[PDB]
UniProtKB/TrEMBL annotation, chain A:
This is Nuclear pore complex protein Nup133. It is found in: Chromosome, Centromere, Kinetochore; Nucleus, Nuclear pore complex. It comes from Xenopus laevis (African clawed frog). Forms part of the Nup160 subcomplex in the nuclear pore which is composed of NUP160, NUP133, NUP107 and Nup96. This complex plays a role in RNA export and in tethering Nup98 and NUP153 to the nucleus. The lineage of its organism: Eukaryota, Metazoa, Chordata, Craniata, Vertebrata. Belongs to the nucleoporin Nup133 family. Involved in poly(A)+ RNA transport. Involved in nephrogenesis.
TrEMBL record, chain B:
Forms part of the Nup160 subcomplex in the nuclear pore which is composed of NUP160, NUP133, NUP107 and Nup96. This complex plays a role in RNA export and in tethering Nup98 and NUP153 to the nucleus. Keywords: Centromere, Chromosome, Kinetochore, mRNA transport, Nuclear pore complex, Nucleus, Protein transport, Translocation, Transport. The chain holds residues 490 to 733 of 1140 of the full protein. It comes from Xenopus laevis (African clawed frog). Belongs to the nucleoporin Nup133 family. One of its GO terms (molecular function) is structural constituent of nuclear pore. One of its GO terms (biological process) is transcription-dependent tethering of RNA polymerase II gene DNA at nuclear periphery. One of its GO terms (cellular component) is cytosol. Involved in poly(A)+ RNA transport. Involved in nephrogenesis. This is Nuclear pore complex protein Nup133. The keyword Transmembrane does not apply. It is found in: Chromosome, Centromere, Kinetochore; Nucleus, Nuclear pore complex.
């Protein structure tokens, strides 16, 4: 639901895979969780599960969105663990 | 136990070359036991004696490494230049991979310069001319530094550099659709810095001929291009003076 309510998967349609993901809700939720201290790999699904989920094929527009989301999730998990 | 590296599963020869350059990167990062384990698991022997053949082999390996990106787990393998499964211009995992490659190259150069034994090595060929393996590694590291400072400029202001690289690719006949990025295409074909220079020259020539050198926006654009070239030359000269 957080991925669906993002302001980039269906609102914006630019070509910059940098600020387009930061101006959403997923990045803000991840930053809030990191500031609170909750683990992003144990209390949340993994990047492999997020990629294998069928919601990406129906909520994506280009590969930039998926790649940026996966990279941000991996970096956040690495900096939290 | 099977010790190897993660690959995006492509062509057989491509995967073999990727494993070879990954073993070379491990040897540079001083992961000798892991490199030997992966070599014994995949091939049989890789590192030989310093000679002209070994210099040419290490040059080809460095070219393949600067053209691709190493990996170990699916997280690092998702950054390999594929077609529809990764590599979409990211200032995080790609930056970390680039800095790891730069650290490995710097460690290898420092080791081969501090051992104090260069008579065993020869001079490989490069574009029909004979050059030393140390000079070739220095040029590869300078290209890597140019790529990382271009990534920093993208993280700063992405639109200008993205449009510049897109115009350069469109002029040099390299159409990029809505699945990849011109910056990633340039990072994959980084071996054409001399062609990218001519592309930027042609872009500036078109920009000056399509205007009337009487405004401020064109002057600001050419100043930004000159500043980008200044940063490129500055980081190149800095790395060269540090390695001298």
């Amino acid at each position: 639901k957080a991925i669906k309510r993002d302001e980039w998967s269906a609102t914006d349609g630019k070509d910059d895979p940098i600020e387009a993901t930061k101006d959403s809700i997923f990045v803000k939720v991840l930053q809030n969780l990191l500031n609170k201290g909750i683990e992003l790999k144990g209390y949340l699904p993994k990047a492999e599960t997020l990629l294998q989920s069928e919601e990406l094929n129906s909520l994506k527009t280009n590969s930039y969105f998926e790649f940026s989301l996966k990279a941000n999730y991996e970096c956040y998990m690495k900096m939290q663990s | 136990a099977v010790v190897k590296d993660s690959r995006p599963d492509q062509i057989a020869h491509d995967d073999k070359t990727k494993h070879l350059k990954a073993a070379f990167l491990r040897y540079c990062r001083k992961d000798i036991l892991g490199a030997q384990s992966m070599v014994d698991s995949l091939f049989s022997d890789s590192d030989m004696e310093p000679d002209d053949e070994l210099d040419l082999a290490v040059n080809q390996i460095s070219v393949d490494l600067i053209d691709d990106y190493p990996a170990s787990d699916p997280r690092w393998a998702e950054s390999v230049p594929e077609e529809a499964a990764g590599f979409s211009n990211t200032s995080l995992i790609l930056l970390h991979q680039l800095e790891d490659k730069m650290k490995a190259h710097s460690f290898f150069v420092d080791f081969l310069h501090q051992v104090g034994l260069f008579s065993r090595l020869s001079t490989c060929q490069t574009k029909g001319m004979l050059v030393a393996t140390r000079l070739l590694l220095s040029e590869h590291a300078e290209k890597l530094s140019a790529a990382i400072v271009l990534k920093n400029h993208h993280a700063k202001l992405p639109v200008l550099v993205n449009s510049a690289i897109q115009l350069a690719l469109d002029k040099r006949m390299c159409t990029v659709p809505q699945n990849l990025t011109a910056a990633d295409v340039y990072f994959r074909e980084v071996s054409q810095m001399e062609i990218i220079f001519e592309c930027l020259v042609d872009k500036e020539e078109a920009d000056l001929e399509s205007t009337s050198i009487d405004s401020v926006e064109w002057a600001n654009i050419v100043v930004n291009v000159n500043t980008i070239l200044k940063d490129m030359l500055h980081v190149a000269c800095q790395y060269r003076q540090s390695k001298n």
